[PDB]
């Protein structure tokens, strides 16, 4: 329900990243999404700003996590919790989505992790927002507020 609402946004964000890198994942073959895309456009724009200002971090993120099938989900939960442990703001929501996107596109497609982890991570990201972030987000006006805040 609400988890689905977030997955729609996360799916499109990850799908564009997948296609830039050149991958062709099942379920992310294309963007038929068409006013909701305005959320996608803002997320890609400000998401790309944050990683282009900290390139070396995201370039080497997977090498430090050394994710395996045993540690992928616990590592995701632990890092996400630590992003918001001392508070929430729209900027941190973005940081969390850029972490997730890079987590699904790069670390999830390493040799020891198959394509099946792309959709799993997207689900982890979506469930996390619906369970842990939905209250604050609707406090700040939902996605409409997200849009106004980043222009």
């Amino acid at each position: 329900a609400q988890e689905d609402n977030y997955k729609r946004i996360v799916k499109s964000y990850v799908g564009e990243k997948l296609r830039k890198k050149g991958l062709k994942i099942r379920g992310y073959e294309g963007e038929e999404l068409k006013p909701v895309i305005e959320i996608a456009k803002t997320l890609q724009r400000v998401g790309d700003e944050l990683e282009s200002a900290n390139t070396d971090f995201f370039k080497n993120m997977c090498d430090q996590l050394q994710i395996t099938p045993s540690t992928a989900y616990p590592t995701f939960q632990s890092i996400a919790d630590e992003i918001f442990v001392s508070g929430k703001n729209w900027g941190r929501v973005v940081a969390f989505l850029t972490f997730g996107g890079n987590f699904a596109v790069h670390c999830a497609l390493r040799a020891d992790m198959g394509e099946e982890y792309v959709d799993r991570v997207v689900n982890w990201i979506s469930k996390y927002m619906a369970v842990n972030l939905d209250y604050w987000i609707n406090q700040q006006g939902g996605w409409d507020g997200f849009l106004i805040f980043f222009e």
Binding site: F57, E82, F84, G91, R92, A95, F99, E151
Partner: peptide, 22 residues
Amino acid sequence: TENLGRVLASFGDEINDKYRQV
């Protein structure tokens, strides 16, 4: 993992500080 999430939250703060119109 611990400090990775803390570094990401600082990255998010830098972005929030920029767009802050307040």
